[PDB]
Amino acid sequence: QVQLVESGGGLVQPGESLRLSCAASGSIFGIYAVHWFRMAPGKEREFTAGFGGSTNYAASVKGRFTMSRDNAKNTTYLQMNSLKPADTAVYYCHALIKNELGFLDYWGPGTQVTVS
Amino acid sequence: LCPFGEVFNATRFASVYAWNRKRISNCVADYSVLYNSASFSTFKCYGVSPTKLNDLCFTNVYADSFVIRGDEVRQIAPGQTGKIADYNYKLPDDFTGCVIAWNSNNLDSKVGGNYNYLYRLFRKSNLKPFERDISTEIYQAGSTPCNGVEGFNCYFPLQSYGFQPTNGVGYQPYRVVVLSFELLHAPATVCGPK
Amino acid sequence: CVNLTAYTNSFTRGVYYPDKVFRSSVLHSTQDLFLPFFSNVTWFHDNPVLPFNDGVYFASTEKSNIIRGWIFGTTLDSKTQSLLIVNNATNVVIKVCEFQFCNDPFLGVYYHKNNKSWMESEFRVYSSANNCTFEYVSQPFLGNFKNLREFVFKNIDGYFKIYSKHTPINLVRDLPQGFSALEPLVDLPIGINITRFQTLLALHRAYYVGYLQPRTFLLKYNENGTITDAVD
Ligand SMILES: *[C@@H]1O[C@H](CO)[C@@H](O[C@@H]2O[C@H](CO)[C@@H](O[C@@H]3O[C@H](CO)[C@@H](O)[C@H](O)[C@@H]3O)[C@H](O)[C@H]2NC(C)=O)[C@H](O)[C@H]1NC(C)=O
Numbered sequence: 450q451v452q453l454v455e456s457g458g459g460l461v462q463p464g465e466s467l468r469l470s471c472a473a474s475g476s477i478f479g480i481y482a483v484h485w486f487r488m489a490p491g492k493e494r495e496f497t498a499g500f501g502g503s504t505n506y507a508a509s510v511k512g513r514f515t516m517s518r519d520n521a522k523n524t525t526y527l528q529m530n531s532l533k534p535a536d537t538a539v540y541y542c543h544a545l546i547k548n549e550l551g552f553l554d555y556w557g558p559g560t561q562v563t564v565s
Numbered sequence: 566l567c568p569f570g571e572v573f574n575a576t577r578f579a580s581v582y583a584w585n586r587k588r589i590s591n592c593v594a595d596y597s598v599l600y601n602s603a604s605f606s607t608f609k610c611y612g613v614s615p616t617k618l619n620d621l622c623f624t625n626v627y628a629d630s631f632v633i634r635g636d637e638v639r640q641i642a643p644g645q646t647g648k649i650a651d652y653n654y655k656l657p658d659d660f661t662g663c664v665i666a667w668n669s670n671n672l673d674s675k676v677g678g679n680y681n682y683l684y685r686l687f688r689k690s691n692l693k694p695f696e697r698d699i700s701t702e703i704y705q706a707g708s709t710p711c712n713g714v715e716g717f718n719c720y721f722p723l724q725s726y727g728f729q730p731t732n733g734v735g736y737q738p739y740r741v742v743v744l745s746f747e748l749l750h751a752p753a754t755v756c757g758p759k
Numbered sequence: 760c761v762n763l764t765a766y767t768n769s770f771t772r773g774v775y776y777p778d779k780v781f782r783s784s785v786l787h788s789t790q791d792l793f794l795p796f797f798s799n800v801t802w803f804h805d806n807p808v809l810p811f812n813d814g815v816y817f818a819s820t821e822k823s824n825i826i827r828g829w830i831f832g833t834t835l836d837s838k839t840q841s842l843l844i845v846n847n848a849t850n851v852v853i854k855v856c857e858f859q860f861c862n863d864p865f866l867g868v869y870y871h872k873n874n875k876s877w878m879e880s881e882f883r884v885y886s887s888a889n890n891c892t893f894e895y896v897s898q899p900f901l902g903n904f905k906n907l908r909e910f911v912f913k914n915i916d917g918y919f920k921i922y923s924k925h926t927p928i929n930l931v932r933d934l935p936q937g938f939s940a941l942e943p944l945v946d947l948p949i950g951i952n953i954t955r956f957q958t959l960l961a962l963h964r965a966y967y968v969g970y971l972q973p974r975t976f977l978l979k980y981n982e983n984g985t986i987t988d989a990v991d
């Protein structure tokens with residue numbers, strides 16, 4: 450039973466740099482992929498950052514986005530820089546992990562960051 | 566008696582794009598639960614007759630659990646060119662496996678919507694039978710590729726299930742487990758209850 | 760894995776029981792892979808991988824227990840499925856997996872940091888486990904070295920047969936004159952292609968070997984059922 454805890458999410462001004470840490474509380478056999486998704490006002494279910502194998506990010510923010518996959522501490526890091534009001538979003542975690550109970554996909558509760 | 570029931574009683578099933586495979590062996594298999602209907606929907610069980618299953622002996626059984634909308638439950642069948650087959654989960658052309666589908670709209674659906682599950686509808690090529698595809702690589706409906714998954718040029722293959730409670734039976738989500746059966750020179754693990 | 764830097768005149772040994780159903784006082788003949796009388800088979804005690812030619816006989820004369828199991832695989836490469844028999848006093852487990860074994864076979868044992876409890880959990884047998892097809896939990900089975908543990912492995916027809924027996928004799932002499940009646944312990948339906956075999960032991964960080972030969976032998980059964988006499 451993997452539990453995803455999001456940390457580092459806070460309301461910030463445009464142009465700021467923020468990190469979201471999605472710590473995996475439950476024990477794991479191994480990780481395949483973990484993907485960030487955005488709920489932004491006027492924006493649907495969309496792919497923030499993840500892989501695609503090699504690390505992949507979204508359009509117009511690929512340089513701003515930075516993925517730090519850590520297989521030792523079991524916490525993934527997302528760095529978004531030069532923030533804009535369009536980046537006001539709930540960043541939902543989604544980790545595809547095979548663990549003790551079994552292969553599963555787990556969705557993080559997500560954190561909302563407001564930019565204006 | 567290996568736990569064929571636990572998959573029926575698992576807390577939550579796998580997504581469409583990523584299907585978890587459990588193989589059961591060195592155990593006696595009971596089809597009594599399958600003699601009873603999974604839900605109001607009668608399961609389609611290919612190959613050998615459902616009433617004859619207790620006599621069958623399989624070298625290995627592979628169980629896959631996933632949740633799908635009621636409309637696409639008919640789509641899953643041995644070897645048909647379909648969206649789930651081409652991009653989500655492919656079954657060989659002529660297969661004897663047994664499909665069990667039971668409605669779970671009440672438990673699964675959320676008023677706010679549970680997007681725990683996605684499907685793939687986009688791919689340049691065809692899906693071989695029984696290979697789980699977790700690739701998130703950029704897809705291009707248009708001919709020209711783009712870097713950075715630009716919207717109007719490149720369209721993401723994965724899209725989520727809303728699972729808002731809907732009266733339409735096609736949208737209602739069913740929990741479905743498929744039982745792949747294979748035979749080879751090795752002795753069959755499956756045994757009859759009596 | 761931390762890599763580290765004889766035959767006796769063999770008569771009347773390990774004839775296994777062929778059938779489980781009860782029989783009494785009759786002279787029966789069956790032609791099957793058997794160890795010949797006076798076969799002069801080899802004795803082991805410093806453990807190379809030995810090719811599995813036919814079914815294999817095996818013996819343990821020592822009173823103390825150091826044997827930790829065996830290793831069964833066609834090659835050291837992972838690709839070939841491997842039968843890891845596990846004989847640990849805590850747990851005896853038949854685990855069949857696509858195993859990439861380490862260069863040195865011995866497992867490792869050590870005591871606890873603060874409790875100094877001698878833990879044998881650490882393994883140094885296989886480097887990797889690629890595809891693990893099977894798991895079984897069986898019954899955990901065990902100065903003149905009185906006891907004799909005698910075993911036969913037979914892998915044919917997708918069936919792997921374990922013929923086991925034990926009997927103490929106070930004689931220190933390596934090979935007793937008296938007959939050895941052997942009972943089947945376990946059967947495995949894995950049927951994995953096995954061309955070679957090795958032992959398995961632990962490391963701090965007496966072993967007859969014969970091959971079954973096709974020949975018919977005569978057995979006289981007791982009223983109780985034991986093999987009182989076996990002859991050519
Ligand atoms: C010698 O070292 C330890 C001594 O205890 C053995 O570890 C045991 O190994 C078995 C089989 O790998 C495992 O037990 C299993 O536990 C699971 C739950 O995790 C459950 O499905 C079963 O109860 C199953 O037996 C476990 O790792 C461990 N068990 C215990 C009680 O310690 C080890 O296997 C022995 N052999 C070797 C070669 O190391």
Ligand SMILES: *[C@@H]1O[C@H](CO)[C@@H](O[C@@H]2O[C@H](CO)[C@@H](O[C@@H]3O[C@H](CO)[C@@H](O)[C@H](O)[C@@H]3O)[C@H](O)[C@H]2NC(C)=O)[C@H](O)[C@H]1NC(C)=O
Pocket residue numbers: 696857889890
């Ligand atoms: C025994 O284990 C080996 C492990 O290498 C299996 O070989 C490959 O295992 C990978 C596991 O991720 C699988 O390949 C994956 O999917 C496709 C297959 O074409 C491809 O995108 C990548 O190769 C990807 O890694 C697949 O199970 C298998 N692939 C091939 C070409 O053999 C092997 O299948 C296992 N044998 C069994 C389970 O009998």
Ligand SMILES: *[C@@H]1O[C@H](CO)[C@@H](O[C@@H]2O[C@H](CO)[C@@H](O[C@@H]3O[C@H](CO)[C@@H](O)[C@H](O)[C@@H]3O)[C@H](O)[C@H]2NC(C)=O)[C@H](O)[C@H]1NC(C)=O
Pocket residue numbers: 981982983
């Ligand atoms: C074949 O063997 C069976 C083994 O169960 C015989 O049954 C009886 O087994 C008990 C258990 O050991 C014997 O008790 C012992 O008898 C000896 C000899 O008198 C005595 O010294 C011991 O203190 C203990 O009491 C019992 O004697 C034995 N039955 C008889 C009639 O001796 C079974 O009878 C055997 N069948 C034959 C006659 O081949």
Ligand SMILES: *[C@@H]1O[C@H](CO)[C@@H](O[C@@H]2O[C@H](CO)[C@@H](O)[C@H](O)[C@H]2NC(C)=O)[C@H](O)[C@H]1NC(C)=O
Pocket residue numbers: 570573574597598599600601602603604
């Ligand atoms: C597991 O889930 C099923 C889903 O309904 C529960 O009910 C069983 O449904 C199957 C459908 O084929 C029947 O064959 C069984 O007879 C049903 N079991 C009953 C009515 O007790 C089932 O109870 C669940 N099991 C557990 C242990 O929770």
Ligand SMILES: *[C@@H]1O[C@H](CO)[C@@H](O)[C@H](O)[C@H]1NC(C)=O
Pocket residue numbers: 833952953954
């Ligand atoms: C077992 O492996 C050996 C070694 O390659 C090979 O010669 C033999 O044909 C194999 N037999 C089976 C049944 O796989």
